[PDB]
């Protein structure tokens, strides 16, 4: 029967909701990844990175997990570690919301946080696994192929299924790049439909836009938690990206607030950025009758400590 053996197996099957105050006559639909265990899209890769490491034998009983996170991946790995019986240590920038810090400790993580100015998180972590290489396993979400793979296997197929194959555009903020990569691979390659894959990054740190334009790559600070890593991650397949949209922090925050107040959707800051980007495309006659699906990575209550509220 439909009873999951632990909480890691209950990932996904998140709903699509049509927006009423964005887009043009309902052409913008949002995928609410806040409806997940640990309540972000990252639960998917928290699960699959652990499952994969188990299956190639890098993760065994007694081995301790390590990775670097801006929060949600950390919370995701923590619920999976707790559910499946692993010890776990994580690194994070000091500047991430208190909520992230708060429940990571409740989930029983040995927590380790780094200089906010350095973003830095990736650095010490590696320095930590070196301490006893067969004690610790680093899962490395920015380059681990188990990250986009679970999106190719679940998130993309769900989108295809729930839109009855009518999806024309996928809009997703880029952090690790796993979401837009896996989803795009599923729909374009597995189901065969030539959609428009749209990456979203902060205008303050538009390193994807700069790279593709062959300009000076200049990362910068921003408030859009979860995206804008300030470099091109290995798990972002540039070859499958058709378009890059930049969004500023203010507009991202205002849009998240609008999602709450006008749509009754409890979205996080990066969800506001993705919808703002989607709304701009949706109001181009060229997309005015395409079906645009927007990933909403996380939920509101994870950001009560931030500018969102």
């Amino acid at each position: 029967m439909a009873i999951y053996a632990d909480n890691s197996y209950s990932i996904g099957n998140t709903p699509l909701v049509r927006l009423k105050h964005f887009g043009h006559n309902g052409n913008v639909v949002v995928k609410i990844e806040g409806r997940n265990p640990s309540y972000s899209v990252k639960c998917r890769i928290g699960a699959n990175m652990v499952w994969q490491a188990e299956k190639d034998g890098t993760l065994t009983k007694g081995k301790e997990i390590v990775d670097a996170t801006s929060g949600n991946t950390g919370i995701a790995l923590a619920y999976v570690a707790a559910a499946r019986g692993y010890k776990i240590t994580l690194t994070m920038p000091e500047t991430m919301s208190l909520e992230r810090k708060r429940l990571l400790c409740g989930l029983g993580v040995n927590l380790v946080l780094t200089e906010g100015a350095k973003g830095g998180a990736i650095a010490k972590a590696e320095e930590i696994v070196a301490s006893d290489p067969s004690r610790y396993v680093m899962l490395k979400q920015f380059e681990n192929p188990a990250n986009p793979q679970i999106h190719r296997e679940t998130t993309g197929p769900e989108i295809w299924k729930d839109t009855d194959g009518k999806v024309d555009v996928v809009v997703a903020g880029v952090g690790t790049g796993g979401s837009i990569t896996g989803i795009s691979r599923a729909i374009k390659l597995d189901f065969g439909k030539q959609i428009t894959s749209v990456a979203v990054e902060p205008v303050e740190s538009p390193v994807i836009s700069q790279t593709l334009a062959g300009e000076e790559v200049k990362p910068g600070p921003h408030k859009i938690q979860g995206i804008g890593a300030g470099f091109i991650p290995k798990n972002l397949d540039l070859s499958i990206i058709d378009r890059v949209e930049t969004v500023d922090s203010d507009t991202a925050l205002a849009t998240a607030r609008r999602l709450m107040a006008e749509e009754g959707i409890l979205a996080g800051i990066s969800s506001g950025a993705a919808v703002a980007a989607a709304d701009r495309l949706a109001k181009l006659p060229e997309f005015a009758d395409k079906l645009i699906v927007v990933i909403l990575p996380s939920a509101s209550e994870r950001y009560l400590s931030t500018a969102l509220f």
């Binding site: 920038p93 100015a117 973003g119 998180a121 600070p221 890593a229 300030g230």
Partner: peptide, 4 residues
Amino acid sequence: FEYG
């Protein structure tokens, strides 16, 4: 927020 920056690198990571």
